[model samples]
Target chain A: MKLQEQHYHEAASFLSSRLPGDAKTAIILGSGLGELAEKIENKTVIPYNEIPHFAQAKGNIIGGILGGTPVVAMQGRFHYYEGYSMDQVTFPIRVMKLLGIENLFVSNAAGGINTSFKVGDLMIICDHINNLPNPLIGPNMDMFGVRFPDMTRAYDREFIAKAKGIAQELNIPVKEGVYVGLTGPSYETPAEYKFWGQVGGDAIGMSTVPEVIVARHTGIRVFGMSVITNEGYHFADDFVNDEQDVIRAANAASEKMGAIFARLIAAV
Target chain B: MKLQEQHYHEAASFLSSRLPGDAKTAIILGSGLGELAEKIENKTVIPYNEIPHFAQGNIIGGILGGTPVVAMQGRFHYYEGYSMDQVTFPIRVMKLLGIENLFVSNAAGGINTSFKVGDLMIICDHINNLPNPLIGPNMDMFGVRFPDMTRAYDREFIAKAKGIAQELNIPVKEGVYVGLTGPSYETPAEYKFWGQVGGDAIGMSTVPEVIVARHTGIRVFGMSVITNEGYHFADDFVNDEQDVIRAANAASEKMGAIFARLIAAV
Candidate 1:
């Protein structure tokens, strides 16, 4: 069924009634990066199945305090490659927006298309090339945003500058570039990687794009990060990208990302 | 309803009983290119609304240049709120009707800096930005789970059409076409990005049909009529639907002639 405003209201009402206090900032954790959610203090764990109009994706919605700031985090996320419609994949963003989320922090494990990028590098997403179906294609919920939202600055500029500053202060190195999002259960071929790189994509993945589009459509400030799990530009004879490997790489770099995200959330 | 093998069998059975004979080649015409269907001799026309499991479009089976063929005067698009299965349903039914070669055409905005408004381009390869139609459960009745797309467009058919164009003295260009699902036209930044990523032209319809055609093991050839210069990058340049159709109508005769000559040669 097509998503309606009532669906968002129902989901938000269910979530709001169970939470301890208001959370102005929300974070969406990607594959293998759920470890950050474990650090939340006084958490109220809510499985996605309990929420109305939410897909059963084996994920949890954790609401609590992180870095001494009230926040919410999604332990796991839905993806377009999982046979979900754009609305289904982006449903949580609207719910969070309705629940008083003013800032969204999205993260994903992506293949590094830039030759300079190494495994386990955190690249801040400054812009994006959305190759997936635009989540705002159907009847625009006029309550959220305009029919034609200006994407000139989908990623918040001041938030990105602040995050870069926080990373520098913490002595954690970071890279900044454009992210390209594609709907994929299968990894990209060499030709696709090369094509995306030429089109100004530094990292490519299957998630984050839809969520960020929805966040911006709801007038929420968005800041995204990609953990480079695999290298797409240079492949060896034994090159292969497995789910286990992606999870491992994301796990290894999650601490540094977690540090930057917590600080950024507190500052915002 | 979900598309099943039985649905294809039913549609093919309905179409076969109406046709004079079996047709090996089929052409799907894009917007403003329906005039070619009127040129078919001894035609048997069927509106798509009459066929079960079919969207709204017209199907014509007739002789073109002494070659028996079927032509789709209109085609489904992903941008029109149709699912990928519905957009590609006709190709699967064509496979059931014993169609071996599929020729597809569309109107595109020119991304190549060297192209003009009235140019015709032979699609060599494509970068599909649209959702792949073969993403769902494997339709074992028609094809395998995975199909090789390294040579999606038939090489021999491309060479034959280029030769035909040369013989007919109709100038043609050749490059990669990028397909995006768009009811809204692209921005200037998008056009620049597409060009940098190796697209000569951009359109919305042909990619899904070509992917389904290849999955069904049919030889495929595609052409594009450049309706607007998307690379002009001028402040006052605007894309209008009526102007695009006007440009496509003016160039249909050239594309039609090349298609007819190539079909006759086959």
Candidate 2:
């Protein structure tokens, strides 16, 4: 048996012991979106360190009922720029799989490269250009999925269509486009954004892509949304990106997103 | 000394001891085009495992009159599970050897609709979709902290290559190349996405090496051979590794001729 697989089983056994709910859906909330976990009723919070063979979690594992469905929300995420390996960044998704999550919902604050996009606007990820080291690079974890998984419909189409209807009923404006995932703690250079823009990337972020790939590998349906935290399009002089501002933008859009997510979950 | 730098220097020192030629121009031959190395009059073959810290190597140090050249066959690849450092370590060794002009060639799947299999494409500009090799802490010995890639693909040489290919009555198509990290071939959606983003040709290697060469301030000239026309679009055929190799072999004569002329000119 692979040591990593052993760790996953041990971690799953430990977490399932504390949370009695069979949460079919898992949500990974991005920066400033931690409040989404508060909406979970009958919540059982578990720190990631308590789990076997897991890195220190940025946020605890919270199990509860959301949208009248049993679910779990990961409040914090690991990013590539934080010096974590691709496997480490995506460890939770595997544990969530062991815990029986059939669907994965992920969110991130991204730079809007599409000219039509504005900060605080919500962009549904339809496809993605993965610029980070693939988490599935090394050994094939046959238990999860094939060594080469088809990315034709990486983002679950049914989930996306359902979310679109929910967003419309709620009268929220949403933009759908391709997401570009990079290993970033530093924002992109103008040339870098230009490269992404040329490649048809509407929004760029650090997380979500790897997690979703893992989810797909595990045969879990995945949906992702981006809070266009910064406009990365052609900017005039005196332009600067502040992390505080990115968080603020995501925070501004969080409530609407939370509502949309709830409706989709309920309907599912 | 950093372990990586130590390895580069050790390899360079070993080669310097064996070969008396200065070999300023370094050419990295792509897969199945290893036959180009045979054109060199005096060759010294050194396998990579024999070096201090290299995964593979085949160095040829000469032009017709041994025109200050070193040819490296069988470069490391990231998709093959090698780290970026290992993939680019040879380029560093060349720069350290005071090699002036760097010439790189690769076999690529043409994404530009106009390009056909067996057509040689001059890499005028490139869009790097690979993970940045300069991502980690910088070693100032290699070069600048933040090197500008605006001139990453040397423009003058691109024009010269075009002129030379034209002058030689050789058919040369020129376009922007995009480097992707892949062990498996791209899906149709990916090829479409890549084309839309202004890529004319796609390959797995070369971009990382060019970026590192630029960082070290070594001027670069690049070429790519369209080994297959399988720029996917709901295509009917399964992509075969053998077909790519066969196509690369077919196009090697033109590439070798073009490289030899370029080497002589440089």
Top DockQ prediction, candidate number: 2
- What overall lDDT, based on C-alpha atoms, would model 2 receive against the true structure? 0.81
Residue lDDT tens for model 1, B178-224? 99886546655577799886899988889999999998899998888
How well is each residue in A63-174 modelled by candidate 2, as lDDT tens digits? 9889898888887788888888878888889999989889988888899888998988898888888878777766568787665455557777799999999999999989
Judge candidate 1 at residue A123 and give its lDDT: 93
Consecutive 10-residue window with the lowest summed lDDT within model 1 chain B: B231-240
DockQ of each: 0.09, 0.13
Report candidate 2's fraction of native contacts: 0.12
Task: Indicate the residue-level lDDT of A185 in model 1.
Answer: 83
- Report every candidate's CA lDDT: 0.85, 0.81
RMSD (Cα, Å) of candidate 1? 7.1
Number of the top-ranking candidate, with lDDT as the measure: 1
- Alpha-carbon interface RMSD for all candidates, in angstroms: 4.8, 4.0
